[PDB]
């Protein structure tokens with residue numbers, strides 16, 4: 274791929290809703306402002322942005338949402354969280370248990386309860402898009418939850434295995450699906466539509482010179498963290 | 510309303526998706542970062558943030574969306590634009606024509622076209638929330654469009670008049686509705702729910718000792734631009 278380098282060093286990156294955010298190995302938190310990854314207050318090991326807001330988790334697995342000028346702590350524990358769904362929150366905890374929060378609950382603040390929904394299965398990484406969520410388990414097996422909607426965040430309730438192996442996976446607001454495998458190779462799912470949410474094939478792509486670490490996609494731009502923590506921007 | 514004053518001066522403010530943005534009298538563009546309004550690049554006369562993204566318009570009525578590190582120009586002309594709907598964009602042009610953009614179009618990039626849908630009618634201000642949009646016309650009359658959805662952004666197609674007079678109006682991600690009238694009074698719509706999207710009445714409240722100019726609400730915090738451009742950050746009681 275034809276990609277440009279952009280200054281910075283990260284371990285994780287997420288793009289969504291026109292925003293791009295990430296964290297470095299020190300767990301410092303960054304937002305892309307006028308083409309500069311800009312440090313903001315916060316300690317997070319994973320930071321996500323999309324239609325559901327700006328959501329992250331820290332080393333203690335506490336959950337944070339940027340609101341009204343700064344991070345506020347939500348109730349619950351997750352090791353990874355994603356905000357790419359249709360105003361829903363999704364993620365996994367330290368036991369690979371899988372949770373989502375429906376739109377109406379996400380948008381209620383202050384709240385007297387945080388009504389997490391547990392999904393049936395085990396995943397180590399989980400990401401949502403417009404009509405589905407995708408994740409991978411501890412054996413790098415890939416799964417899709419179909420029929421996900423804003424107030425039925427758990428979708429059909431039954432995960433479907435998609436052949437292949439990936440270590441992480443992200444779903445974009447246009448429905449695009451990208452992931453990186455344990456060997457540091459980068460893949461895109463082809464043939465993904467609302468009518469065929471599972472898509473058809475995995476295609477190989479190269480953005481990094483010596484291996485890929487993390488990937489996210491938004492609005493025609495593929496974002497990579499390479500193995501050395503450096504960043505690539507690939508306008509597709 | 511229990512308020513603090515946040516340093517700065519704005520003419521317009523919008524809050525949504527946990528973000529707070531706005532523009533000043535000079536059309537400098539701001540985002541609230543770590544409790545400080547921070548200038549970003551851009552000349553905009555209205556800047557909105559919500560589940561549909563970060564959308565603004567400039568003095569020439571060109572439309573801009575923040576994506577991938579900076580503003581990109583979309584097709585079309587609007588004098589006001591809102592991103593509070595469910596991944597839909599809505600707004601009005603200089604002739605008070607009313608438009609919306611469906612979710613699937615909003616999320617498509619590259620796009621050699623921005624396929625705006627025109628709603629029948631005239632409004633000078635239009636704002637969207639989770640299941641409806643509200644607007645006001647040039648005579649300050651108030652309207653709701655119900656059962657707006659991500660890929661039917663035009664909703665029922667039948668604007669319903671809600672008695673009262675307002676100069677602008679905003680709809681929050683939790684469905685809350687607030688507005689400011691021509692005299693600088695501030696109102697909330699009471700009784701708004703999914704079962705009753707039109708609500709029941711208007712209630713007056715004051716955040717600005719010197720009168721109100723603009724309002725937006727998100728996640729339990731009401732944001733005011735006062736008549737003098739000062740900024741109040743409030744919680745409800």
Ligand SMILES: *[C@@H]1O[C@H](CO)[C@@H](O[C@@H]2O[C@H](CO)[C@@H](O)[C@H](O)[C@H]2NC(C)=O)[C@H](O)[C@H]1NC(C)=O
Pocket residue numbers: 298299300317318331332333
């Ligand atoms: C940044 O966050 C990571 C992930 O939480 C921290 O690394 C973990 O630290 C805990 C102890 O606090 C250990 O139980 C884990 O084994 C560590 N995981 C990994 C992958 O290293 C890391 O220490 C944090 N760094 C800073 C500077 O805050």
Ligand SMILES: *[C@@H]1O[C@H](CO)[C@@H](O[C@@H]2O[C@H](CO)[C@@H](O)[C@H](O)[C@H]2NC(C)=O)[C@H](O)[C@H]1NC(C)=O
Pocket residue numbers: 534535536554567568569
């Ligand atoms: C900021 O934008 C406003 C709104 O476009 C500008 O005020 C308008 O200026 C135009 C000329 O470009 C006039 O035709 C309008 O009558 C003005 N409208 C209002 C409401 O005053 C304003 O000049 C801009 N300021 C800067 C520094 O860019």
Ligand SMILES: [Ca+2]
Pocket residue numbers: 287288289321322323355356357400401443444489
């Ligand atoms: Ca994501």
Ligand SMILES: [Ca+2]
Pocket residue numbers: 523524525557558559591592593636637679680725
């Ligand atoms: Ca708004």
